[PDB]
Structures are given as structure tokens and as C-alpha cells.
Design a protein around this ligand. Structure first.
Ligand SMILES: O=C1C[C@@H](C(=O)O)NC(=O)N1
Ligand SMILES: O=C1C[C@@H](C(=O)O)NC(=O)N1
Ligand SMILES: [Zn+2]
Ligand SMILES: [Zn+2]
Ligand SMILES: [Zn+2]
Ligand SMILES: [Zn+2]
Ligand SMILES: [Zn+2]
Ligand SMILES: [Zn+2]
Ligand SMILES: [Zn+2]
Ligand SMILES: [Zn+2]
Lengths: 363, 363
């Protein structure tokens, strides 16, 4: 017998369109999402061109509306030039993304003062998420306190980071965070198998002690999110390997395996892939939407999953238990046993739904 | 201009039917809910007869389906006789309620061993909430740890209690809690005005220091919930005053006043009256459901609100800013400017909706 789950939400995916469509596009990345039991995705802005201004957002919105097979919201990206310019379009985005460590020149911020300017100008009711590693977590938390608002920390990967966030929560500070599956299910012990190119990811794979600290501190983790970051094998194995792993198709099977082993409960999983994503990002419900999983099916992850154009996976060879059998999205069968049955363009921008606007006080 | 809020959820109401219908019934109590911007309520089991067995739950379900004007779920109550007997009906309830301090003989538990028996036998995926004051909070937390599951603490009212829960959360323990408006907006300073009969409530009104501690520790409060506990003025002013305040019609106006004063944000309010109730109790979304409020309207709370049969209020004379103008419930206008426009029986048991079952692992 199957277990019915609600429509799961992945708040951190890179779908590569516009500009990197050999790595993934909206159609292939949302097929991967559906096959992973994900019915809503929030897409990051580090595309080509990057989503750092209103014209780029308008283009990305149309490409997503035409290509997405599941529902979505699109992040805006902070740049060294756009603070104070996004007010008209801010509410149409998933939130604002700050890249505070390595990134493309276009999203690079050169000074903490530029972080402050974004925290001061971005509407105070709308989400801000940050790629912030190691001491950068503490630094961006300080900026958030100076500007008296919340922040969400992307892909927490280290004991150091989860304990800092734990200490901030103990002081009542408004901070939430997410953890990606590779930081729960891979470690330095896997680098020999992966090799130095495939193994490149940011944040990097942690030690066994980092992984054990994230599990021990599950109560501190608000969301799981894949950081689906597809690149082709040629790129990962070449001379300048880009960081990132594909992850939409493997995230839920890995976590269902952990549920079956008693490492966390089904409820713990649903808080982190459904309820907390909804409440942190004010994402709306999806009517008549659910996912049926088979928790008894044992399988081994292959060298590539069927849908992502990345056409490789760092989880190859891992034994999992749990698999997505059927997905229904807004009353239509979207996925059954390896077949996606909704076309490109079936998905919608949830921020355009009446229930998908972030509530705010009047002017 | 009005602000659109989602359908708010009150996880702690006493609607008095069956058996106390001069105090309130499903029809009057859910009218009060709608007028307060509440579209879903969870009704407590200390009725007459109390909802402590399958026949009593079946009766209450039919009375609620026939009388409720907003959607609902019904709690089961723990008794000294029913542990291990509720398995067939448990999933149809909001959760299990434990009355661990004063209550009716029928819901009284005489030993902590009886609490353990309930924690051991009630299905582990379903909610347990407790009326647990002062050291009882620590005691029920110990039982929850011994049985390796979560607990939700009702109406936290004291500095002592919120700090204990804060310490438990810092240790990663699975505990959530709610706070009622009277413990945020009334104190010992109001007892002279209220008098000793009207002022009777459990948990009792706190000191100014208790109130200030709850506000200071807002980050620890997961939900607001009214503990709507209607009794008539004759009862409150008579020789054996029953404890409790009506609160559905005043909760949102009081909290909107606090939002307008910057004491908490609109988001803080919506986490506590919408998102966290959903996720702790696995309550489903309500399609095409929303509440429109006017945040600029100043008014003074009168001697009784229009709908509750309690026909009195302890907040009489308080100045508030914010008022419910319109409620839409599942596509129908349910309330406009003092008129309820859905009949008794419009409301439904959300636990019977496919999306309203609590997910669980198979047998
Ligand atoms: O910060 C990032 C971004 C991402 C990408 O490839 O877009 N991949 C990563 O590994 N880290
Ligand atoms: O515990 C309770 C229950 C309630 C009631 O009247 O049912 N009223 C109270 O004041 N405390
Ligand atoms: Zn990142
Ligand atoms: Zn993220
Ligand atoms: Zn990323
Ligand atoms: Zn929301
Ligand atoms: Zn109580
Ligand atoms: Zn309660
Ligand atoms: Zn109560
Ligand atoms: Zn749920």
C-alpha cells in the first residue's frame, strides 16, 4: 500500500534557463522535480542573464510559464547595482537571494555595506535568503539584526554553521535554515569515489563529524532543499569543474530511506519539505495535489537519473528504500512510474495566484 | 484599503455542544469564530457527555456537521478508562486532549502512570495537547520524553512556563505551545475591574511580569489560540463561578492592535494563527478562503460581542484598532460587517477531507 503525501516544495533549485539550457531547462528540471515527488520549486537567479532586474525577471517568467511542468516561484538576485531598484517587482518574486561567497561577477557583492543596503531597501515583509558559509553566517546574521529583520540561510553544511544558528535561535533571533541531501548523505569519505571534479560543490562536502552534527541537530533545520545544481558530466570532469550536484530526483528517496531506518519521522520530513517551506516563503497551497510513495521498494541509485539533463549523480551506488509512484498536480496526473504526463507549460507562477501574494500592511 | 489574510485557525475552543448549549452551541460559537476572522476551529472534548469514547464522538460529529458555520475538527479527551480504546477513531479527531490539572471528574487522571498509558497507546503520529500548568508542564514533558514523542502545551500563561518550554526547545525536545489573548492583554491589574467571578479563568491571569515575559519570549510561542470558554454572566457572577473567558470575537482585533503598535509583525501573527496551527495539527488548507480586515478602524470593546452566547467579555473597555470586514469560506461570503451569511451546517469536518488525514507509515 502507498502513502499519500502532500505536494512537496523545494525552495532551492537551479533550472539554468535562460542561458544554460544544455545543463537543464524549465521543462527538464521540472520533470525531474515531479519524478522526485516535488510539485513546487523556487528557482535561483544565477542564470545567464542573471535575474537581477525587471527585464530579466520578465523574460524568466515567460520562459518558466512556457516550460515548467510543476508550479514555481522565481527568486531575484542581489547585485552591486540593484539595491533600491527592485521595489516594483519584489512582491512577484519568491524572495531575494544574496550570494555572499563565491559566485559570478554579476552577483558578487564587494562589501558588507552592500548587504546592509539590500536589507534596508528590499521590502521588509518579503523573504531574503543567503548563500553564507562559515563566518559569513554570523556576518549576515549581524546585518539582519542591524536592520531588524529575518534571514534564511541556504544549504547549511557544517557543524560550525548549525551550532551558530542553534545559538541564534536560542537568543530568539529570526533566522531559519535549510539543509541539502548531499550534506546529510555524503561526506569526505565519498571524495575518493567521486573524484575531485564530480566532488566539487559549494558548500563543499563535510567531514563525518559535520554530517553527524546536522543529524544530531535536526531540530534546528527548518527545511530540506536540494540545491539542484545541474552541470553536465563533461563539465564536472573537465579542466574547470563547476560546483554543484543535481538532486531533485534523489532527494525524496534518500530521505524516505532515512525515515524507514528511524533516523527521522515522516512528520519531520513533511515539516521540512512542505509546511516550513510554505510558512517561511508564504507559498500557497496547491489544490488537489498529492504524491503517492511506496516505502517498501528497495533499489540502487544508477549512474544517472532519467530526467535531469545533468545525466550523472553523486549518489550512484547508494541503496535506497522508498520510491515515488504517482504525482497528481491540481487534479491532473503529472507522473506515474517513470513517465511524466503533464506537458511543458502546465506549471504556473504561484506568486500570481491571489493566495500566493505575501501579506503586507498597507501604505 | 483592506488587508487580505488567509483563513485563520483557532486550535482551542469550547463550543459547549452537546450538553451546555445555553453557554454556546456549534452555530453560535462558529458565528463568533467567523466574526473574529477564524475559518477553522478545533473544539475541546469537555462537553456533556464528554468526548471520551466512540459513541460520544459520533454524536458530536453529527451535531457539528449540522450546526457549524465554519470548518472544524473535534478533539478526543483522555480519561482514566479509555487508554488503548481509541485506536479505531483516533485519526478522525483533531488530536487527544489531556486535562492534567483541574477538570471534570470524567476527564480527571489520578496518576502520571495514566498519562504514560495514553502517550504509549495513542497513535504516535497523531497530536497530543495538554492543559498543564506550572510544574505540570515539566512533568508532561518528562512523560513525552519517556515515550519518545512530541507534546503541545495549551494556553501558556506564566513566565515560569514559557521559560521552561524555551529551555526544552534549546535542548531540541519536540514541544510546541500556544498562548491565549487574555494572557497577553490582561493581568492581575485587571482583577479589580473584572471582579472575582468574571476574573476566574484557568490558567489564572498572570502578573505584569508574566505578561511581559510572554511578549519578550514571542519567539517561543508557536500558536495563538483563544481558549474560547463561554459561560453566561449569571454563571460567572454567581456563587460557584466557572473558569473561562469567551474570546473568538476579540482575539484578532486585540492582536491586530498589537501589530499596529509594532509589538509583533503581521507575519508573526500569521505564523501563529495560520501556518503553525496547520503544521502542528496537520490541518488542511481551505480552498478559496480568506479574511479582509481594516487596520485603521478604532473602536472600544463593548460589554458583549454580538455572537457568543456568553453575552459578556473581560476585554470590555479596551481600545482596539483593526476589525474584520469580510470573510469568504470555500467560495461563499460567510461574514460581512456584523452579518453572518452562511447557515448552520455550512461547516465541515476537515478530518474527513482527503487532504485532512494525518499522514502515517503503513502497518
Ligand atoms: O553556490 C552554488 C551555486 C550552484 C550552481 O551551480 O549554480 N552550485 C554549487 O555547488 N554552489
Ligand atoms: O481548563 C479550562 C477549561 C475551560 C472551560 O470552561 O471549559 N475554562 C478555563 O478557564 N480553563
Ligand atoms: Zn548556494
Ligand atoms: Zn537556499
Ligand atoms: Zn544554489
Ligand atoms: Zn503565509
Ligand atoms: Zn485548558
Ligand atoms: Zn490548547
Ligand atoms: Zn480549554
Ligand atoms: Zn501536514
Amino acid at each position: 500500500k502507498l502513502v499519500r503525501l502532500p505536494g512537496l516544495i523545494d525552495v532551492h533549485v537551479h533550472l539554468r534557463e535562460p542561458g544554460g539550457t544544455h545543463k537543464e531547462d524549465f521543462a527538464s528540471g521540472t520533470a525531474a522535480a515531479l519524478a522526485g515527488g516535488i510539485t513546487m520549486v523556487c528557482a535561483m537567479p544565477n542564470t545567464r542573464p542573471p535575474i537581477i532586474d525587471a527585464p530579466a525577471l520578465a523574460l524568466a517568467q515567460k520562459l518558466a510559464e512556457a516550460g515548467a511542468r510543476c508550479d514555481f516561484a522565481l527568486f531575484l538576485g542581489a547585485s552591486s547595482e540593484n539595491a533600491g531598484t527592485l521595489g516594483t517587482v519584489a512582491g512577484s518574486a519568491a524572495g531575494l537571494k544574496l550570494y555572499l561567497n563565491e559566485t559570478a561577477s554579476e552577483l558578487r557583492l564587494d562589501s558588507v555595506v552592500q548587504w546592509m543596503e539590500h536589507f534596508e531597501t528590499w521590502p521588509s515583509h518579503l523573504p531574503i535568503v543567503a548563500h553564507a558559509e562559515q563566518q559569513t553566517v554570523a556576518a549576515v546574521l549581524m546585518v539582519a539584526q542591524l536592520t531588524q529583520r529575518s534571514v534564511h540561510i541556504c544549504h547549511v553544511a557544517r557543524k560550525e554553521e548549525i551550532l551558530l544558528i542553534k545559538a541564534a535561535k536560542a537568543r530568539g533571533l529570526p533566522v531559519t535554515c535549510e539543509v541539502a541531501p548531499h550534506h546529510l548523505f555524503l561526506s569526505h569519505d565519498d571524495l575518493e569515489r567521486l573524484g575531485p571534479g564530480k566532488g566539487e560543490v559549494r558548500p563543499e562536502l563535510g567531514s563525518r563529524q559535520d554530517v553527524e552534527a546536522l543529524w544530531e541537530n535536526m531540530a534546528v533545520i527548518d527545511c530540506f532543499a536540494s540545491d539542484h545544481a545541474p552541470h553536465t558530466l563533461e563539465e564536472k570532469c573537465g579542466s574547470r569543474p563547476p560546483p554543484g550536484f543535481p538532486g531533485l530526483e534523489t532527494m525524496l528517496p534518500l530521505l524516505l530511506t532515512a525515515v524507514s531506518e528511524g533516523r527521522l519521522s515522516l512528520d519531520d520530513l513533511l515539516q521540512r519539505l512542505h509546511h516550513n517551506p510554505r510558512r517561511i516563503f508564504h507559498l500557497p497551497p496547491q489544490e488537489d495535489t498529492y504524491v503517492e510513495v511506496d516505502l517498501e521498494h528497495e533499489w540502487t541509485i544508477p549512474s544517472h537519473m532519467p530526467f535531469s539533463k545533468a545525466h550523472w549523480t553523486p549518489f550512484e551506488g547508494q541503496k535506497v528504500k522508498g520510491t515515488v509512484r504517482r504525482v497528481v498536480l491540481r487534479g491532473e496526473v503529472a507522473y506515474i512510474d517513470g513517465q511524466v504526463l503533464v506537458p511543458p507549460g502546465y506549471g504556473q507562477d504561484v506568486r500570481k495566484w491571489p493566495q500566493g501574494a505575501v501579506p503586507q500592511l498597507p501604505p
